[PDB]
Amino acid sequence: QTETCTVAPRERQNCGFPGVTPSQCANKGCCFDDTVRGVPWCFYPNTIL
């Protein structure tokens, strides 16, 4: 792996859309988390090393 879903919520950039599902987020190669408010559910991953 070269990408990680460990992103600070205030740094998460929107990768999806209103009502995006994990499957639609996985199709785009992005990360999903709806347990944090005020941030996009589907966001881009962070680069490692």
Q: Tell me if residue 26 falls in helix, strand or coil.
A: helix
For the chain, the structural domain boundaries read: 2-49
Residue reference for tokens 């929107």: 14
Residue 12: name the closest of 2, 3, 25, 38 by CA: 38
Experimentally determined by: X-ray
Whether the Cβ atoms of residue 6 and residue 47 lie closer than 8 Å to each other: no
DSSP state of 48: -
**Would you say the C-alpha torsion 33, 36, 40, 45 has a positive or negative sign?**
negative
Nominal resolution (angstroms): 2.4
